[PDB]
Write an enzyme that holds these catalytic residues in place. Structure first.
Site, PDB file in Angstrom:
ATOM      1  N   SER A 175      37.349  30.707  36.543  1.00  9.93           N
ATOM      2  CA  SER A 175      36.620  31.830  35.963  1.00  9.93           C
ATOM      3  C   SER A 175      35.879  31.496  34.673  1.00  9.93           C
ATOM      4  CB  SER A 175      37.556  32.998  35.682  1.00  9.93           C
ATOM      5  OG  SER A 175      37.899  33.715  36.815  1.00  9.93           O
ATOM      6  N   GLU A 196      35.906  32.495  46.382  1.00 12.57           N
ATOM      7  CA  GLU A 196      35.922  31.194  47.057  1.00 12.57           C
ATOM      8  C   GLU A 196      35.804  30.031  46.067  1.00 12.57           C
ATOM      9  OE1 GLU A 196      36.789  32.575  50.657  1.00 12.57           O
ATOM     10  OE2 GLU A 196      36.302  30.436  50.593  1.00 12.57           O
TER      11      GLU A 196
HETATM   12  C1  BX9 Z   1      41.945  33.675  42.978  1.00 12.90           C
HETATM   13  C2  BX9 Z   1      42.298  33.699  41.498  1.00 12.90           C
HETATM   14  C3  BX9 Z   1      43.627  34.440  41.149  1.00 12.90           C
HETATM   15  S1  BX9 Z   1      44.852  33.596  40.046  1.00 12.90           S
HETATM   16  C4  BX9 Z   1      41.092  34.331  40.773  1.00 12.90           C
HETATM   17  O1  BX9 Z   1      40.511  35.316  41.122  1.00 12.90           O
HETATM   18  N1  BX9 Z   1      40.663  33.656  39.593  1.00 12.90           N
HETATM   19  C5  BX9 Z   1      39.613  34.212  38.775  1.00 12.90           C
HETATM   20  B1  BX9 Z   1      38.876  33.010  38.080  1.00 12.90           B
HETATM   21  O2  BX9 Z   1      39.586  32.147  37.320  1.00 12.90           O
HETATM   22  O3  BX9 Z   1      37.858  32.517  38.804  1.00 12.90           O
HETATM   23  C6  BX9 Z   1      40.398  35.138  37.866  1.00 12.90           C
HETATM   24  C7  BX9 Z   1      41.620  34.732  37.398  1.00 12.90           C
HETATM   25  C8  BX9 Z   1      42.382  35.520  36.550  1.00 12.90           C
HETATM   26  C9  BX9 Z   1      41.936  36.771  36.199  1.00 12.90           C
HETATM   27  F1  BX9 Z   1      42.703  37.545  35.387  1.00 12.90           F
HETATM   28  C10 BX9 Z   1      40.724  37.204  36.696  1.00 12.90           C
HETATM   29  C11 BX9 Z   1      39.953  36.396  37.509  1.00 12.90           C
END
Ligand code: BX9
Length: 264
Positions: free
Chosen positions: A45, A143
């Site tokens: 993220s 993804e």
């Molecule tokens: C599939 C993973 C879950 S651990 C995800 O959505 N990560 C995003 B990012 O890092 O791209 C994310 C992670 C933590 C958040 F609190 C929000 C968004």
């Protein structure tokens, strides 16, 4: 980049079990600290900080972009979208989407802004335009989190992350108002209290953007830090690990940040 007193990083890395990537620069003196700073790590993220910067850059040519309301649908709401979820019934402005992406890592908000910018390729084009030849975003949330060993998709290097962060927050890549807005968004991040922020003296101001892929022990943070009476430090700490089931470690990220800061 190189580092002739790398053994502390090497030992932390061995204890962690995976790979650590660090780059830190004191913008006053030019000193840097590096460890796998040239090696590719998944963005996860953390791309969302650069995404918000790209939005601000576009707003310099598009009056009222930031104020534009977006009345998004329910099926924009991929998981881990707490702000977009909360505000589904009202919609959100481009500025609010940018703040939510930065300060809560809001997934849906990032996808909506990516669409406004022409997708991963558009954000990647923005990054090329400020001179970052390493950054690449290829995919959307969720993804882009697959973090497969050796996959160059959705990766950059700690040094390119730091160098771009410096350009956008402290240099000339953004106009002064946009530059201030980006800094303020980073300073208001809520996701980073156990990462770089845990390594910084309590009396130094900090802005940061985290990343957490959820697999392969992969997680990261980058930050601008303002020491007492000094020019700011800019740094990036990225991690990954060889097994899909490996857990990321916030403490490792904090510890590597501390080694960087102590090195400077
Ligand atoms: C599939 C993973 C879950 S651990 C995800 O959505 N990560 C995003 B990012 O890092 O791209 C994310 C992670 C933590 C958040 F609190 C929000 C968004």
């Amino acid at each position: 980049s190189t580092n002739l007193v790398a053994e502390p990083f090497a030992k932390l890395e061995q204890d962690f079990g995976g790979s650590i990537g660090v780059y830190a620069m004191d913008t006053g003196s030019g000193a840097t600290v590096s460890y796998r700073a040239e090696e590719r790590f998944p963005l996860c993220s953390s791309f969302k900080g650069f995404l918000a910067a790209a939005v601000l850059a576009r707003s310099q040519q598009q009056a009222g972009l930031l104020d534009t309301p977006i009345r998004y649908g329910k099926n924009a709401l991929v998981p881990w979208s707490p702000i977009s979820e909360k505000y589904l019934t009202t919609g959100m402005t481009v500025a609010e989407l940018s703040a939510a992406a930065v300060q809560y890592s809001d997934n849906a908000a990032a996808n909506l802004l990516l669409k406004e910018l022409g997708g991963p390729a558009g954000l990647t084009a923005f990054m090329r335009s400020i001179g970052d030849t390493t950054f690449r975003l290829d995919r959307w949330e969720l993804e882009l989190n697959s973090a497969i060993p050796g996959d160059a998709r959705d990766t950059s290097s700690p040094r390119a992350v730091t160098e771009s962060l410096q350009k956008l927050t402290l240099g000339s890549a953004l106009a002064a108002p946009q530059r201030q807005q980006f800094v303020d968004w980073l300073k208001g991040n809520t996701t980073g209290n156990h990462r770089i922020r845990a390594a910084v003296p309590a009396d130094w101001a900090v802005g940061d953007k985290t990343g957490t892929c959820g697999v392969y022990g992969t997680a990261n943070d980058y930050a601008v830090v303002w020491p007492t009476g000094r020019a700011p430090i800019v740094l990036a700490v990225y991690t990954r690990a060889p097994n899909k089931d490996d857990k990321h470690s916030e403490a490792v990220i904090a510890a590597a940040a501390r080694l960087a800061l102590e090195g400077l």
